[PDB]
Each structure stands twice: as structure tokens, then as C-alpha cells.
């Protein structure tokens, strides 16, 4: 039949007798009105994970079958709202009134239904867009030590999507309710709530809800992808899902493994991260992209969860605490961070300029570790150090101030060609604002030419003429 009775209750898990026809992954309802998900089908008992308060469920209480898999609401109606992992509102702005509801455990797009990634996802961060480029349909991991900027890079990225036809989803996982309130308020202040959805499963919410949050985040983000529109999903900590999954598995009595995690921990993040894709023209050409975040203890890049996700994604952005406590912000280590879609996820303008940046910056990472203290060396080494110091000042940037690609390629072009050789290393930041102020008068000219033509090869004569004559006449 479709009815059972609870036999054991504890720590957010229940065991029931009966329920002969339950399906693996189905939803079940308790006499209390609370919901649960059936995850184990033993020979004589069903193992149920509770989706609510469990201190009201007693041994001998009845449970009934709902004949349905886990399903969430989807549509444009969710834009500007705050919701829980089950698709219920949290902002207190009234009901959602959705038109359709769909499963949380859909299969990923096959190898023939995809198309190569070739269109950019501008983050507005000088170090990321130039050296570690992201394309629509890609998966880029943000990984680092605690308190290094991570939520900052994800929110600076969402703020930059105001002009483009992109929809953003933010999944708050295991986060404190007061930090979630500062994130929602920051998005409302920058006007990002016009094109974003927030899914939250905070630290006091049941382990079950904190486990279904990213899957519900993909169901909402891939809806726009199947309509031809672009979408972006962000997971603030994937390290917190692994912990929430470890609890449910060790309580259901499933065999443990490395760091007590169950054998299917690689499969958990793989089912999720392979759903980000750029589809083919037969499917409408849509695109979903993901920004998973990971927390590493004292730089343990070789721990079980960091190695699983580093192997699954199309690249990673490493943040370091010694860079952070030394003034380099955002604290991204350019030497260890890579994008495997580089040279295709960039516009022609950036590809021409970033080539020189890669060589100048690569020769600097090696040289400063040893030649920083020495008083007199060969002029080549002096010029390599002086250029590397100036380029590492151009890559520094403050929070909530993302740069449009047209402004980025202009400043990088000026630095790479070496027009800053007479400018002191402390003055480089003042030069960026002063040069961009002169360019405000030319924004009408260079915005239309760099945005439409993207031809920095033709533009060389105008950039050289303005940069040299304007500064040499004023500085002499």
C-alpha cells in the first residue's frame, strides 16, 4: 500500500515500516504535516530524510506516500525574490504565483547537444578578464583561504551583468542569516535585484534543505537556458554541501571513507556541475554557467573535496592569504590560476593586448623572489622588475567597482606598451583615474569604436596620439 508507520526517530532522520511502493528519491508526508525524502529502501524499512522540524514526529506515527519526486517552481516571476530550497518565499513580498513546476534531478546535456564556448562573460575584474577569462557555458572554481575575497568576486561579477541579457542566481549555502541579509541589501542597493534570484539554505536550516539548494538553483538557472537566454549560477560554498551530505549519510548508516565522506561524494558535485553548458542551434543556442566556491584549510589544495571539484571544472581562481595581508587585492595568485577556454572566451581586442600582459607578468613572478634586494644588476633585469611592479599595480582594484571591457583594454594597452616608465610605482593608481578622466571626453568616440568594431589594431594611432600628447604636455 501507500501508508507506513515510523519505527525510529532521531537527528533529522526517520525509519518507517510499510510504504511497499515508494520510489527511490520520492517525497513522503508525516501525520504532523511535515515533508520528507525517501533515500534508502532496506528489505523491511524505508530510510527517510526530514525536510522540516523533527521534534514533533514520534515512533508509531503514520506516514503517507505523495506519488511525486522533488519539484520546484520556475519562471521570470522569481526575478527579484528571496526563496528557500523548496521554492517558498522568505522576503515577505507575497506569494510567488508560478506557472510551472519541474524536477530537481534532471540529466545533463549530452556531448552532441553542446557547442564550443566562444562568447565572453565579463566579470569586470582586471586580473580575471585579462589573465583568467570566463566564457558563457563554462564552469570556473573560486578557491581560497578564509577571509580572502570570494563572496566579493562573485557579487562584483553579478553587479557587472546590468547591461547584458543575462539572469543571475545566488545560492547561499550554510551561511549565517545576518550575512545573507547584507548580500540581499547590497544587491538591492546596486540595482542587481532587477535581474537576480536568491535561493537560501542558512546554517540553522535542516541538513536536507542545505543539500537540495544547488539542485534547485540549477532547475531555476537552466529554465532560461532552454529558452535561448543566458544564465549564471553561483554557489557560495560547495565545501558546506559536502558536510551536509556527510551528516545524512553517516546517520542513514552508509559506509564511510576518506575524511568520513561517502563513496558518492565525487558523483554529488559531478551531477551538479556538468549541467552548465553552451547548447547547439537545434536546442536554441542557450547557455548556463557556474561559479562554485570552495574554502580550503591552511591551503589544503590536496584535500578530498578541493581535489574532486578542481578536477571537474574548466579552470580555477586561487586566492591566497599572504597576498591578502600584503595589500594585493583582489588576492588572486596569477601563477597557480588557469582557464582552459583562454583565447576563445575573450573578444579580439583583449586577445591582442593580454598576450603582452602574460609575458611581462610571467617574467616578473620568477624575478622578484630573488632579485628584489640587489642594488646594481643588468639594465634588462631592471626594466623587467620595473615593468612587473607597474603591471601588478594596474591589476589591483577596489570592491563594487567593476570595469567595462573597453576601459580595461585601454589601460592594459597603455601599461603593456610601456608608457608608464616615467610614472612612480605609487602614482600608477592616480594615472588610471587621470587617464580615464581624459578619455571621458572621448567615451562617445571610443565606446562606439571598441564596442562595435573591437579592432585595437586599427585604433593604435589614436590611442598613442592621445596618451603621449595629453600627459607629456601636462606633466612637463
Amino acid at each position: 500500500s501507500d501508508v507506513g508507520t515510523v519505527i525510529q526517530v532521531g537527528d533529522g532522520i526517520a525509519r518507517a515500516h510499510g510504504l511497499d511502493n515508494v520510489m527511490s528519491g520520492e517525497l513522503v508526508e508525516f501525520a504532523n504535516g511535515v515533508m520528507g525524502m525517501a533515500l534508502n529502501l532496506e528489505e523491511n524499512n524505508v530510510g527517510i530524510v526530514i525536510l522540516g522540524p523533527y521534534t514533533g514526529i514520534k515512533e508509531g506515527d503514520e506516514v503517507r506516500r505523495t506519488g511525486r519526486i522533488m519539484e520546484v517552481p520556475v519562471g521570470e516571476e522569481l526575478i527579484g525574490r528571496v526563496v528557500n530550497a523548496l521554492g517558498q518565499p522568505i522576503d515577505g513580498k507575497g506569494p510567488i504565483n508560478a506557472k510551472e513546476f519541474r524536477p530537481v534531478e534532471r540529466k545533463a546535456p549530452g556531448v552532441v547537444d553542446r557547442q564550443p564556448v566562444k562568447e565572453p562573460l565579463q566579470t569586470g575584474i582586471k586580473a580575471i578578464d585579462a589573465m583568467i577569462p570566463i566564457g558563457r557555458g563554462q564552469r570556473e572554481l573560486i578557491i581560497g583561504d578564509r577571509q580572502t575575497g570570494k563572496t566579493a568576486i562573485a557579487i562584483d561579477t553579478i553587479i557587472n551583468q546590468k547591461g547584458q541579457d543575462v539572469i543571475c542566481i545566488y545560492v547561499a549555502i550554510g551561511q549565517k542569516q545576518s550575512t545573507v541579509a547584507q548580500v540581499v541589501k547590497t544587491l538591492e542597493e546596486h540595482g542587481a535585484m532587477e535581474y537576480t534570484i536568491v535561493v537560501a539554505a542558512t546554517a540553522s536550516d535542516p541538513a536536507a534543505l542545505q543539500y537540495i539548494a544547488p539542485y534547485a538553483g540549477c532547475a531555476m538557472g537552466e529554465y532560461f537556458r532552454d529558452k535561448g537566454k543566458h544564465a549564471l549560477v553561483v554557489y557560495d560554498d560547495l565545501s558546506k554541501h559536502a558536510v551536509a551530505y556527510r551528516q545524512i549519510s553517516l546517520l542513514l548508516r552508509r559506509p564511510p571513507g576518506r575524511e568520513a565522506y561517502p563513496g558518492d561524494v565525487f558523483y554529488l558535485h559531478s551531477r551538479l556541475l556538468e549541467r552548465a553548458a553552451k547548447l547547439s542551434d537545434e536546442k536554441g543556442g542557450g547557455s548556463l554557467t557556474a561559479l562554485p566556491i570552495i574554502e580550503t584549510q591552511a591551503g589544503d589544495v590536496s584535500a578530498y573535496i578541493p581535489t574532486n571539484v578542481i578536477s571537474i571544472t574548466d579552470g580555477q581562481i586561487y586566492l591566497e592569504s599572504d597576498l591578502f595581508y600584503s595589500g594585493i587585492r583582489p588576492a588572486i595568485n596569477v601563477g597557480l590560476s588557469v582557464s582552459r577556454v583562454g583565447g576563445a572566451a575573450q573578444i579580439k581586442a583583449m586577445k591582442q593586448v593580454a598576450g603582452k600582459l602574460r609575458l611581462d607578468l610571467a617574467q616578473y613572478r620568477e624575478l622578484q623572489a630573488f632579485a628584489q634586494f640587489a642594488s646594481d644588476l643588468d639594465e634588462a633585469t631592471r626594466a623587467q622588475l620595473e615593468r612587473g611592479q607597474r603591471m601588478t599595480e594596474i591589476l589591483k582594484q577596489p570592491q563594487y567597482s567593476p570595469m567595462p571591457v573597453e576601459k580595461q583594454v585601454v589601460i592594459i594597452y597603455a601599461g603593456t606598451n610601456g608608457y608608464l616608465d616615467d610614472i612612480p610605482v605609487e602614482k600608477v593608481k592616480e594615472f588610471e583615474d587621470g587617464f580615464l578622466e581624459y578619455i571621458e571626453s572621448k567615451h562617445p568616440d571610443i565606446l562606439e569604436e571598441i564596442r562595435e568594431k573591437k579592432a585595437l589594431d586599427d585604433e593604435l594611432e589614436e590611442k598613442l596620439k592621445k596618451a603621449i600628447k595629453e600627459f607629456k604636455a601636462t606633466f612637463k
Binding site: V6, Q177, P256
Partner: protein, 469 residues
């Protein structure tokens, strides 16, 4: 409809309710027994329900010693969780885990009692206003400002200065604040609680304070539930009366450890480093309740014990995501005699944003961290290459960094026995003014030994004159 004890396994006990009317999870049970013969012993015990087993049986955790318990005794179901007295009649008292008085002043006559387990506030009714709360301590007031209405965490290993820092904060913040104060000694020394109570009695601060203990010698059941008893009392002043309140807690690690000690006996599979499979869930139910709502604010200072100076241990690592300010105490500074031993690189807060603090406060704090971070990497090299091989910019950074690191030290009022000095208070403007002269090189001539256990920067010049330089 009563129950019977079936298994006694140290702290854990199993009870069977034959009628089928079983107690809910977290309910409180009573064992009151009078000895029938000369062989038996009189017993008075409380146990809380933890898990529902199959054959009309429940697992329960005892809040006191289980010695003298016999299989087949009689158990009474109270019908609700551990309910603690709440109201203004709890002020100037000291309490047990069950909210009973541990002082000899007589019974408490509070008209209401509240259960220690309550749902946390919702996202729709929280608040997050930002202002600077002064401590009078040179390091905390500059490098990691305390947010009013926010959680503060003091992290450290054994004997680094945590309790001597909590005590100085109580004698500074609470002594400069109108409103109630609450203190919970979670699994600490019963000798320290006695000295705190006497200091309060002398000063007169007990009239505005509440104390809860359940110390190291108590069983695991009491050591984890004590923090909830102190919290249900600080919540009544916020939610019912509307007043702002301070919650001070020493050793929140004992709450995590006590949960791990009982987890194996309940039947739960073990997890990483020998912790329970529910560590993050149990710390979140505690930390998510200590927040500022639309009605009133709870400012909280917590001391965290790091088992072997390794911040990567599950209990300290799980704690870091909940704080608004974190201060790390390092034995490296303590062994050099630099107290309070706060690490100037690893210490941070939600308030070190250019939009919240003054311009020079932000500049001085960022310059201190850069000079000390540069010195940290360079001092290691000097041990193998020797100080003669480094450049003039490096020598200048070494000389200034030594003086900066020593000026971070201060004599506390509670540390007179350990320091042989009376104790001093430094206001924020003097902390900023003092550190700026060292960074700008004004005092390059003053010896590095004129900054240990000093107060204001004027004293360093007077002390150098007393040293005949």
C-alpha cells in the same frame, strides 16, 4: 503512565514507556527515589530525551552522575523540555544547568519559565546597524574593532591569555554600558567562577548581571546544555523587555567536546578527528539565536579553545563562519612576554571597511599589517644569512616592526599579580595617534625595550628618560 530504566551505560540511560505514550525529543524526565532497604541509595536526577528507539524505548542523557541507579526504577515524564525561570528576578543570582540557584540567597520567585530549546529569529525580523564599540585595549580598538550588536571570537591554545582577555573586556565594556550583562562559564575551572563572583560583589555589578556555571567536573549532559540556559535568559531581555544585552562565554569548545563525548554512546557513526556526525548543526542552533532583531541587540564575546594550536581542528574550523570579528592569540608572542598576545595579521572584523571607520584609522591599520607581514617573511632569512647581509630598507623595516610589535602590549587591570603593574586604559584617538608616530619613524631613536607593558606613547619617552636615554 510512567516509564522504567532498562540500561545504564555511564552518562546515557535507556527508558521504556509501556503505555505507548512516549516523550517527545528534548523533553525532560525525572527520577526521584527513596531507598527501600539499607542496601539502596536515595536518588534525584533529570534526563533529557535524545532519540526514539523501536520497542517503546527512548535514549536519554543524564544531567548529573548516574551512580546508584538500578534497572527497573520509576521515571516520570514532565511533558516539556528543561524550563528555566525568566524575568528581572534572575538579576544578581547564580545558576545551575537546570536554572536552579547555586548561591545561598534562597528561592527565585519569577512568575514565568521558558524552555532552553526555541526556534531562532527569521530573516524578515533581523537588524544590522554598524558602529564602533570601544574596549580601551590598543590591539582590538585599532586592528579588529568590535561591532556593537555583533559576535566576537577570541581563539587560542592552552595558557595564551583568553580568560585574562575576557575578564578585562567585562571590566571595560560592561563597566561603560547601561543595560543587562550575562556570563556563562561553559566547562571551565570552578576557582575562576568564584573569583569573578567576588569581584562583582565588591564592585556592585551583580545587580545588573546573571551568571550560569555547570563546570568541568559535571557529566557531558550538563556541559553541553549550559550555554542554552544562559542564552534563554539573555533572550528575555531582548524580546520581552527590549533592552540591549551582553553575553560573555568562556570555552565554547567544551560544548562541542561534550556533544562528541555522548555521541558514541547514543549509537551514531563517528566522523573526522573523532567528532559527532552533527557538529555543524549543533553549533548553528546555538550561534543562530545570538543575533540583533528589530526589538533589541545581543553583543557577544566568546572564547574558543584550539586543541593543539591548529585552527584546522573541526570545532574551531566550524566556528569561524559565525563571527563578526575574530581575534587569534598566538603562543609565539606570549613566550616573548608580549601580552595580550593578539596576532596582528590573522585578526580581522566586519567593521574594517573604508565607509565605516575614519580615514587615518583605515590607513594606520593597513600600514601596520603590511610592515609586520614584510618583517614576518624577512626575520626567517636573517637566522640563516645573518642581519649584515640584508639591505637598508630591510634593516629599517626590522627596526620599526620590532617597536610596533612591542607597543601592541598593554598592562591589564585584572593582570596586576602576573605583571607587577597597576593596569591602564587607552582611548581610540590615542591608539591611532600612538601607532602613527611609530609608522612615520618619529621614534626611531627610542629603544625597543621601552614599549613592553606600557600605555600611551608619552610614557615610552618618559620611560626612555628614566632608562637614561
Amino acid at each position: 503512565t510512567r516509564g522504567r530504566v532498562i540500561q545504564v551505560m555511564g552518562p546515557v540511560v535507556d527508558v521504556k514507556f509501556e503505555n505507548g505514550h512516549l516523550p517527545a525529543i528534548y523533553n525532560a524526565l525525572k527520577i526521584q527515589h527513596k531507598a527501600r532497604n539499607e542496601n539502596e541509595v536515595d536518588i534525584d536526577l533529570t534526563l533529557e530525551v535524545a532519540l526514539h528507539l523501536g520497542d517503546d524505548t527512548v535514549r536519554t542523557i543524564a544531567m548529573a552522575s548516574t551512580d546508584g541507579l538500578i534497572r527497573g526504577m520509576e521515571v516520570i515524564d514532565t511533558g516539556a523540555p528543561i524550563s528555566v525561570p525568566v524575568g528581572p528576578e534572575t538579576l544578581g543570582r547564580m545558576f545551575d544547568v537546570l536554572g536552579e540557584p547555586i548561591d545561598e540567597k534562597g528561592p527565585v520567585k519569577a512568575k514565568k519559565r521558558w524552555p532552553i530549546h526555541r526556534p531562532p529569529p527569521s530573516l524578515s525580523e533581523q537588524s544590522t546597524e554598524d558602529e564602533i564599540l570601544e574596549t580601551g585595549i590598543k590591539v582590538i580598538d585599532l586592528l579588529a574593532p568590535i561591532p556593537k550588536g555583533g559576535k566576537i571570537g577570541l581563539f587560542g591554545g592552552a595558557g595564551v591569555g583568553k580568560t585574562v582577555l575576557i575578564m578585562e573586556l567585562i571590566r571595560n565594556i560592561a563597566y561603560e554600558h547601561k543595560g543587562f550583562s550575562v556570563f556563562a562559564g561553559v566547562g571551565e575551572r570552578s576557582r575562576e567562577g568564584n573569583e569573578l563572583w567576588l569581584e562583582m560583589k565588591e564592585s556592585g555589578v551583580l545587580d545588573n548581571t546573571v551568571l550560569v556555571f555547570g563546570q568541568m567536573n559535571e557529566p557531558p549532559g550538563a556541559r553541553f546544555r549550559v550555554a542554552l540556559t544562559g542564552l534563554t535568559m539573555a533572550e528575555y531581555f531582548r524580546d520581552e523587555e527590549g533592552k540591549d544585552v551582553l553575553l560573555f562565554i568562556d570555552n565554547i569548545f567544551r560544548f562541542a567536546q561534550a556533544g562528541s563525548e555522548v555521541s558514541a554512546l547514543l549509537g551514531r557513526m563517528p566522523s573526522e578527528v573523532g567528532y559527532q556526525p552533527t557538529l555543524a548543526t549543533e553549533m548553528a542552533e546555538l550561534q543562530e539565536r545570538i543575533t540583533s532583531t528589530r526589538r533589541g541587540s545581543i553583543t557577544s564575546v566568546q572564547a574558543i579553545y584550539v586543541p593543539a594550536d591548529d585552527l584546522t581542528d573541526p570545532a574551531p574550523a566550524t566556528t569561524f563562519a559565525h563571527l563578526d570579528a575574530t581575534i587569534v592569540l598566538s603562543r609565539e608572542l606570549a613566550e616573548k612576554g608580549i601580552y595580550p598576545a593578539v596576532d596582528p595579521l590573522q585578526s580581522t572584523s566586519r567593521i574594517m571597511d573604508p565607509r565605516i571607520v575614519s580615514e587615518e584609522h583605515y590607513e594606520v591599520a593597513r600600514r601596520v599589517r603590511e610592515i609586520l607581514q614584510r618583517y614576518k617573511d624577512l626575520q626567517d632569512i636573517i637566522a640563516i644569512l645573518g642581519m649584515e647581509e640584508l639591505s637598508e630598507e630591510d634593516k629599517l623595516i626590522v627596526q620599526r616592526a620590532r617597536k610596533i610589535q612591542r607597543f601592541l602590549s598593554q598592562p591589564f587591570h585584572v593582570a596586576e599579580h602576573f605583571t607587577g603593574r597597576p593596569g591602564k586604559y587607552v582611548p581610540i584617538e590615542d591608539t591611532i595617534r600612538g601607532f602613527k608616530e611609530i609608522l612615520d619613524g618619529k621614534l626611531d631613536d627610542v629603544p625597543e625595550q621601552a614599549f613592553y607593558m606600557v600605555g600611551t606613547i608619552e610614557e615610552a619617552v618618559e620611560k626612555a628618560k628614566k632608562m637614561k636615554k
